[PDB]
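User: I'm putting together a teaching handout on how multi-component assemblies are represented. Below are the sequence lines for each component of a complex, exactly as they appear in our records. Could you produce the 3D structure of the whole assembly as structure tokens, so the students can see both representations side by side? Please keep the chain order the same as the input.
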Amino acid sequence: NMPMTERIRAGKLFTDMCEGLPEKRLRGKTLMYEFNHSHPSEVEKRESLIKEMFATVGENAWVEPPVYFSYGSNIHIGRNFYANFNLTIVDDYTVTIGDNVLIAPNVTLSVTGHPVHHELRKNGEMYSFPITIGNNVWIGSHVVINPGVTIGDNSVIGAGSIVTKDIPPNVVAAGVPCRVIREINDRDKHYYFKDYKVES
Amino acid sequence: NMPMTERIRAGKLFTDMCEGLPEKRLRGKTLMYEFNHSHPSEVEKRESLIKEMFATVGENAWVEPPVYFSYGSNIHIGRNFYANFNLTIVDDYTVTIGDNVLIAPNVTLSVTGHPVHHELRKNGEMYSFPITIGNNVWIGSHVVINPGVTIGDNSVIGAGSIVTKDIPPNVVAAGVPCRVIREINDRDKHYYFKDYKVES
Amino acid sequence: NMPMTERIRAGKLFTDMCEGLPEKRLRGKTLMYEFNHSHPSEVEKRESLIKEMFATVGENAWVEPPVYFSYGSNIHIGRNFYANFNLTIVDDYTVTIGDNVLIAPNVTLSVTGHPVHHELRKNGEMYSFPITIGNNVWIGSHVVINPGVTIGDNSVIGAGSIVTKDIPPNVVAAGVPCRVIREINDRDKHYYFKDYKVES
Ligand SMILES: CC(=O)SCCNC(=O)CCNC(=O)[C@H](O)C(C)(C)COP(=O)(O)OP(=O)(O)OC[C@H]1O[C@@H](n2cnc3c(N)ncnc32)[C@H](O)[C@@H]1OP(=O)(O)O
Ligand SMILES: CC(=O)SCCNC(=O)CCNC(=O)[C@H](O)C(C)(C)COP(=O)(O)OP(=O)(O)OC[C@H]1O[C@@H](n2cnc3c(N)ncnc32)[C@H](O)[C@@H]1OP(=O)(O)O
Ligand SMILES: CC(=O)SCCNC(=O)CCNC(=O)[C@H](O)C(C)(C)COP(=O)(O)OP(=O)(O)OC[C@H]1O[C@@H](n2cnc3c(N)ncnc32)[C@H](O)[C@@H]1OP(=O)(O)O
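Assistant: Of course. Below is the structure of the complete assembly, with chains in the same order as your input.
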């Protein structure tokens, strides 16, 4: 006897078929549908749905439809946020993105997991831990960010990464599981790609 | 002497632009279209389309649109099935899923593949080997399951896994390619995440 | 610096909010919307759009909706092209696909990337390097192909690989990051999958 809602915040196992959760979900997923199916020319429309879908959205935010979430109202986005096609966020709990964050296509964030033992999840039980994307972070394509992960500022996450651990700031991380490939140093102020110098 | 119908069943190479296959594909993608572009409030309709779309569906099935498949009628689902956003199932041949199966967002299932040799696929020839998912299986995000793969009951597939070989029951598997990581023991019956236990 | 469209062609850092780039994108995303939302029965309309969406498309092209791209007009496709669901192509610059190329579902092609050093991207500045996919290439599901990569003729990219470097022709590459597994020999002329021969 503890409201599901309060079990989420406590990191306890819960289910979401009650206490107004389903109604919340239908509100968000309703806005999601008119965004996702809006005509590319309906820019103002899209512009308001964004402010509308997420609990928090800074200025100069852009999201290439389609976009997917469970609620929408648990996603708090910062300034100048760009997200490319198919950004999926399972926001059963807090998801926070800093400023000037760039998100490539087909990225997946999820504060939710299921107990490994199929007996702790007989009724699709879940747990939720907040994700936190720092400022000036860049996430490559097909990246997956798992429950309770924090990505430090100005860091980069390579395409295909499966982030399962916290990622410090100022690094470059990649792999399955995602691991720190390396620190970003002055050479990166000159070389922006493979063998290409900033001064051509 | 053997139709393409019999070739698929036999595991032999084939092509699907005859024997009514194309027309079969159209019927399924038509219901698929209606399902994928349905309003979140069209609850009844969504439920009826599901029992329509797939060959078999057990009680309490839920698929979060959009869903992608080739025929849909080659897929058999057990009971209490929950698939999140963008489940993709290339079912040129039979796909069987058990009960209490949980599928995270952006998961691709595929019974189909193509000869490695470009000489064998001059006309895009393929082979199809059924996929079999046990009961109480949980599949992480961005996981891909290749042709003829069998996942043993109660097993867990970590996010981003690329499954090319059969997974035994009662295991936690992950990686690229997927490798059995450990056995699911009774220590999992208390712990569900890092160091979070369960009390009375 | 110098004009934005030039920086592109020169592999220099650029932003795309001028020189008519946004409008160019709107026509693209417009034809894209018309394609993605078409009905499975509207085959003739789907074919006109294919020819209209991309710069060049050889005969026999088939693209299963939905398909995603930035401009569309920066894509050149050969002949007997086949792409399954959710092909995403960030064609900020040229993307060339040869003949008899088969693409599995959920593949992402991006000629664009961002300077890893945040100071070099304050205004989400990016670079773009063409992508060249040879003839008779087969790309598996959930593959990601990064900027300026060349996939040789007759090669195969396993499901889930993250292709960061060029792939030689006649090989089988897979992995994160993608690495050459072996060369396509003549045994591949008999065995097409796990242990199945052609005549026996
Ligand atoms: C926001 C938008 O919608 S547009 C942006 C869309 N862009 C993309 O999706 C492309 C994303 N780019 C990447 O992921 C690139 O791989 C980068 C930027 C992470 C490469 O990291 P960099 O430090 O610049 O590359 P670098 O050459 O030093 O790579 C070093 C090693 O890491 C490996 N590596 C690089 N990227 C990855 C990756 N994603 N996964 C695994 N390994 C990787 C390399 O293969 C290399 O191998 P080696 O050590 O054996 O030599
Ligand atoms: C179903 C829905 O629609 S909503 C929920 C969707 N959720 C997902 O897709 C999230 C999937 N979660 C995972 O993959 C988790 O990482 C789990 C389930 C595998 C947890 O791993 P566990 O087996 O419990 O063990 P643990 O967390 O200790 O991991 C141990 C090691 O495996 C690694 N690991 C964890 N997950 C993965 C993964 N997906 N791929 C590869 N390695 C992984 C860890 O990094 C760690 O590294 P180490 O050996 O250096 O210590
Ligand atoms: C166009 C369409 O719509 S068709 C539908 C799309 N189809 C798919 O997505 C299926 C993709 N198939 C694959 O990825 C398969 O793994 C193939 C075709 C690459 C098989 O590889 P093959 O060339 O036949 O060689 P083989 O199976 O022996 O692989 C050898 C090793 O490579 C590894 N390997 C194979 N495929 C992959 C992969 N995708 N990623 C990583 N490793 C892989 C194997 O695990 C194996 O491990 P080991 O050497 O330690 O034992």
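A couple of points students might notice: The two ends of chain C are 66 Å apart (CA to CA). Chain C has one domain: 1-200.
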